[PDB]
Design an enzyme around this catalytic site. Structure first.
Site, PDB file in Angstrom:
ATOM      1  N   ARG A  93      12.926   5.660  -5.652  1.00 21.84           N
ATOM      2  CA  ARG A  93      13.043   4.333  -6.020  1.00 21.84           C
ATOM      3  C   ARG A  93      13.531   3.923  -7.149  1.00 21.84           C
ATOM      4  NH1 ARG A  93      10.063   0.405  -2.987  1.00 21.84           N
ATOM      5  NH2 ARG A  93       9.149   1.549  -0.991  1.00 21.84           N
ATOM      6  N   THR A  95       8.489  -2.425  12.074  1.00 19.81           N
ATOM      7  CA  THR A  95       9.277  -2.997  11.033  1.00 19.81           C
ATOM      8  C   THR A  95      10.295  -4.102  11.532  1.00 19.81           C
ATOM      9  OG1 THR A  95       9.068  -0.926   9.856  1.00 19.81           O
ATOM     10  CG2 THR A  95      10.873  -2.473   8.908  1.00 19.81           C
TER      11      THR A  95
END
Ligand SMILES: O=P(O)(O)OC[C@H]1O[C@](O)(COP(=O)(O)O)[C@@H](O)[C@@H]1O
Ligand SMILES: O=P(O)(O)OC[C@H]1O[C@](O)(COP(=O)(O)O)[C@@H](O)[C@@H]1O
Ligand SMILES: O=P(O)(O)OC[C@H]1O[C@](O)(COP(=O)(O)O)[C@@H](O)[C@@H]1O
Ligand SMILES: Cn1cc(C(=O)c2cccc(Cl)c2Cl)cc1C(N)=O
Ligand SMILES: Cn1cc(C(=O)c2cccc(Cl)c2Cl)cc1C(N)=O
Ligand SMILES: Cn1cc(C(=O)c2cccc(Cl)c2Cl)cc1C(N)=O
Lengths: 511, 513, 512
Positions: C107, C309
């Site tokens: 991240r 998703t």
């Protein structure tokens, strides 16, 4: 509708059966070849002419009995009768010649009654060859005691007498009589389960095979084939001079059934010789062996002959029994390329009626085939390959079903392009047009093939010679009632002269 | 290892799905036509050259907005970009021009906007004094037969179904309605009538004008809007006349009526667009898939082109990759059996038009290899009628042959398209290389799945057998240059017995030289 | 003329497609599970009550964001809204709680100090990703920081680096070229599809989160980026004795996980096709291959599969979905996904009850569109011929339910198992699973067809009375939910003695 076409539209195997209709007439074309054994009842030129007219495709000559002089005279009379129709090549029908070998034999050395549950000793002792009774029995096989175990069965004289071995040795066996009956002289011995080491060709067989090469026979129906070595031995004996003569292996025992795949790969085709098979295996199991071998031959694309007792009551009677009508139909339905007559044409009182009945039943059964499932399964199972002729053959059969074709006309030198069409089982008759006389005779081995022998001289342009040959086949099917003017047919040809080049599929209206 | 060939060998649909493999590369052939809508993002000659390189087959022109002068300049730009590649005929790709009509519509009047409150009561008028006096109580619209075509309890949608209504009371001049879904009511907004047999004409007076303009501009095909019945397609064909007799009419199925009367429309048309945009405005949005797979399957069964259309790659207007729903929609449309897939705003006005074309090309190519051809080809001939036509029998024979030898291609010589079209309905794995000397035939061949049209520009030989052999050898050159096959691969070749159209009866299994 | 029964009678797959009919309405039962991710938009007990009513079966907590306090309070509110219908056990719907793990994520840092600040990126620009930890909160248009320290140790010059669901594409020339611009925000997912990232299977954050899941009594774990069978075994051993009945769903999200699917599936309790990460790690055009492979193999093995998703991604801002989105949901159900998922559509979006409803509607239309004639024949043929009496009973029950066109299949089950064995043969009829185990009732939502009911009635002293009390309880449920009426015919599955593993009895009964 005609030709069971309502049953042809069915979604399931059961609904196909439900729609089978006795008032639906078949086409003129009969696809299954008919093999007739020739003997005293059907040997004359006059009878043989009618045998051809009633529908005989292959004349079988059984070399279990009869001298070379008797058989050459028979072969001469077959050809005399065949060539009497040669003045019109439009209506000429090629007739094949088959040599059926005697094979390896086990024989006994006046009737003695064997008691049910008694002691019978077999011997190899050579002074008891004229001294056979209820205690002592002699055989001509010398390696009997090694191939047979303790508790193994010994059948004598078409399986009428059954023995079972209690104690094994070297010079002897002592058996127990399980099935009784009267013991006689020079009677056939069978050994169920055993791997018999008797040679592939006998000394008689070798001379008879060489006589086959001399007499220009089209196929060899080879007896008692146990393994691939056996086919290779027949092939070696036939030599270079007999190399285009087809070898059809007769599957006659347990070992032949168990080694089916190596035999099929080595041979040019198969006979389900149910006569001896039903002596060697249990009689309730013969149908399993029949459907297995027919299936696998359909899968391989090699000829399969169903043989023996198909219309057995017709030796004495002019109509068959209902079992017999059913046997012929179900063999054709199973997928047998040829059906055979033995004593029905060789010795019986109604040989013409038996040929007619085989023609009538086969034509009715070819219509009743569920080609919707059958073409689907044969396609799925046959592999993806890079042979152009194979891709052309399957495209032709596909095209023939889509237009409900009158025929598939195939030009062929060796047979093969037409053989490759036949293995995908079209409804439409395959007219194989050839200049080669042996190819025309050998085409009767393959379901669907209607061989024509073109006698017309070679045209000066090659494309024109091809067109002339296509036209000759147009003329045959119009005169034999297969199709008329404006019916749509499939035409198979190649791109250059010579074998191996069939690559071209045409869809044409009949002019 | 390649082109999902292991999955192709599977004995069931389930094991076919289980064997689908992401490391099994497809061939360079992509069979599905990509129809790109041209607008401000993609209009220039420079951008259009890249669009063809990215894989555009059909340039769609939307005649809902824009002047004839504007559209003709778009068409000229399309043709300039297309003809820039004509110096290499082996590498030249034909590009179709499509005309999408405006269609008949129901519009609101003039308020500037108002506020429609949820759960309140609204009133519909046809009285022309309230035409420019629309408010939160009174609404005017322009279709005067509205009271005849709705009954009590039925729905009325305004502004692409933003505002839902339900009529509680109806008169002969007027309707009284409760507001179901609230929202901003603006001026001149679209009105749909869900479930209604609307009597708006097949061709409007703007549509008449634009259809004759396509004939002048030599368009290859017409995407005709709002088609409800057989007589509607006949009207389009009538308006096009004999001057436009070879122009393909693709019916857009846009409402309940068109879906319910599908069989007559299909029979009157050259092909079908599943126009999902308006279809999901008119029918509930969860039922669009049922109508998608119905129309695609029937068109497959009939052998006529079907276009999947609208929001296939929607997020790509703003984004350079699509969503996972969008990837799946393009895949499953190709898997359903759609001959063509469309882009609207993705190529008209969005930020990434080249990436959108490239994505439809990449997804279609993958989905074509994942087709279960074994069950599909088996089902296609089992439903096919037994006829006496020689070309139809040749076609299925050619496709059968192509599966048996896993051929590089089916090479078809064609004048009007039709012989190659007959191959295309049997869905082979092999690309269909259609060779033609006709320019329009090459352009219109993009409508049919499988077809890779090449335009031969080599002159007519004197011996016709030599002229046939030249065109076959040209198609050999194309597939060699485009990586479809190489020397010594086996391909299928379709020719006919004489010159002229309608005689394809000859199938040949041929080595590539 | 209902349930696409005209389509069901077709002899071919193509004619089944041809007969699909927009005017043929479905049954009331919806067989596919709906998993909703709970975040800010769906957090409140008020919204959660309406989620359950709109058709939510599983609440997913995503532990890529948020603290343990945030998630415990989310869990408590799920359980408050679930237990607000517990008063009538006939109308109580069990709601499962799933923990979705962070996993080996890379991240980004904070844009200018905060989570919600955004910069704009343009095509063809240059930005420099650095590793020194002073730049971890002052990321901008020029300098980015990411937490994976071995970034230089695996990639090459020319490798692609993808930020924020693959939308921002970069390319290492680390000094990079902005291949694709757009909005760059804070704390966004980073992918390296070329690289062989040696990040651990279960990280230290994962351990704290899995511990928390055990303490909060979660029903299942959605384990991120599973690569191999030993990744599954590692999660199994982290959960230990205390979390042995917690199901492990392995999210397949990269190339290695797809390649080693067969060993993952045998070890796991179920599979998530995690299409978001999968579509960046592998070419996005191959996602559907991977989706249908995995759904197919899970249907063949009898283990649950979740399609996840961006299924309704535009519904984050819009009250209606795009045409792609309606098609995706349908096609996932048609493929054979046991569960469908919503992420940001329920977590943070403007219309979250409309997304749950839209999934409920599409799935129910798609379940009617299943070509059951082919499917059941293929599922039977690929089933092993076994000496298991429970397997023979379940397949006889499904066969019987097709023959009478049954209103339901009622299955008494302790562990879930007998009802799972029915579900794998894919009947049209809803499976009413009657249990007294509340965890079994929550975990049954993983399987297509299964409508779980929790019996709160006490044990009758005669066992056959207690069996018939549970059968008549289930009978009351389908009468109350409109699955069947009085005089309709249902299939009842029971066993010959109490306790798990003895289901051998199939009964075809009228509804009283
Ligand atoms: O079946 P075979 O022996 O290959 O014969 C097929 C051959 O027959 C032909 O059609 C005609 O050849 P010929 O002119 O030599 O008879 C060839 O083009 C083709 O290769
Ligand atoms: O698809 P269509 O329009 O029938 O065209 C196919 C035609 O093409 C050909 O192969 C070549 O014809 P041309 O020489 O007239 O172009 C014909 O033999 C055949 O009839
Ligand atoms: O699916 P599981 O866990 O095997 O449960 C099925 C069991 O439930 C029962 O139907 C009822 O048993 P209990 O009375 O112990 O609940 C048993 O007969 C059967 O063995
Ligand atoms: C009426 N009938 C039709 C058939 C066949 O066509 C058939 C025969 C062999 C193999 C395959 Cl695959 C098929 Cl489909 C069989 C019968 C019968 N024996 O009753
Ligand atoms: C993988 N896949 C393969 C197919 C088809 O080939 C197919 C498509 C349409 C009709 C028929 Cl009959 C068939 Cl067989 C569909 C899928 C899918 N939708 O997932
Ligand atoms: C309409 N439709 C029906 C199906 C199935 O029932 C199906 C789905 C998965 C496996 C098997 Cl074996 C089958 Cl048969 C698929 C579609 C589709 N994807 O279009």
């Amino acid at each position: 509708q005609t030709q069971q076409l309502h049953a042809a539209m069915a979604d399931t195997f059961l609904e196909h059966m439900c729609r089978l209709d006795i008032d639906s007439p078949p086409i003129t074309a009969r696809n299954t070849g008919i093999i007739c054994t020739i003997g005293p009842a059907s040997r004359s030129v006059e009878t043989l002419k009618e045998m051809i007219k009633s529908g005989m495709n292959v004349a079988r000559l059984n070399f279990s009995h009869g001298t070379h002089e008797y058989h050459a005279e028979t072969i001469k009379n077959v050809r005399t009768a065949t060539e009497s129709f040669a003045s019109d090549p439009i209506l000429y029908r090629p007739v094949a010649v088959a040599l059926d070998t005697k094979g390896p034999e086990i024989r006994t050395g006046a009737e003695v009654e064997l008691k049910k549950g008694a002691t019978l000793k077999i011997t190899l002792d050579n002074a008891y060859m004229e001294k056979c009774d209820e205690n002592i029995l002699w055989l001509d096989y010398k390696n009997i005691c090694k191939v047979v175990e303790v508790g193994s069965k010994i059948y004598v004289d078409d399986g009428l007498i059954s023995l079972q071995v209690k104690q094994k040795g070297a010079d002897f066996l002592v058996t127990e009589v399980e099935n009784g009956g009267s013991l006689g002289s020079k009677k056939g011995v069978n050994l169920p389960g055993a791997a018999v080491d008797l040679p592939a060709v006998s000394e008689k067989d070798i001379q008879d095979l060489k006589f086959g090469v001399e007499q220009d026979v089209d196929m060899v129906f080879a007896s008692f084939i146990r393994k691939a070595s056996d086919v290779h031995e027949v092939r070696k004996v036939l030599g270079e001079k007999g190399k285009n003569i087809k070898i059809i292996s007769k599957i006659e025992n347990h070992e032949g059934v168990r080694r089916f795949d190596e035999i099929l790969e080595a041979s040019d085709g198969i006979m389900v010789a149910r006569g001896d098979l039903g002596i060697e295996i249990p009689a309730e199991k013969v149908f399993l062996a029949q459907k297995m071998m027919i299936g696998r031959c359909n899968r391989a694309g090699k000829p399969v002959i169903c043989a023996t007792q198909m219309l057995e009551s017709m030796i004495k009677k002019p109509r068959p029994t209902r079992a017999e009508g059913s046997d012929v139909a179900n063999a054709v339905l199973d997928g047998a390329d040829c059906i055979m007559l033995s004593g029905e044409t060789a010795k019986g009182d109604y040989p013409l009626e038996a040929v007619r009945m085989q023609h009538l039943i086969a034509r009715e059964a070819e219509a009743a085939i569920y080609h919707l499932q059958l073409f689907e399964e044969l396609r799925r199972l046959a592999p993806i390959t890079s042979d152009p002729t194979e891709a052309t053959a399957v495209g032709a059969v596909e095209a023939s079903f889509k237009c409900c074709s009158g025929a598939i006309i195939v030009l062929t030198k060796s047979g093969r392009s037409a053989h490759q069409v036949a293995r995908y089982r079209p409804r439409a008759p395959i007219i194989a047009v050839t200049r080669n006389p042996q190819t025309a005779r050998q085409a009767h081995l393959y379901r669907g093939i209607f061989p024509v022998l073109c006698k017309d001289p070679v045209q000066e342009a090659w494309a024109e010679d091809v067109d002339l040959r296509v036209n000759f086949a147009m003329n045959v099917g119009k005169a034999r009632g297969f199709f008329k003017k404006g019916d749509v047919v499939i035409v198979l040809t190649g791109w250059r002269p010579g074998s191996g080049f069939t690559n071209t599929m045409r869809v044409v209206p009949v002019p």
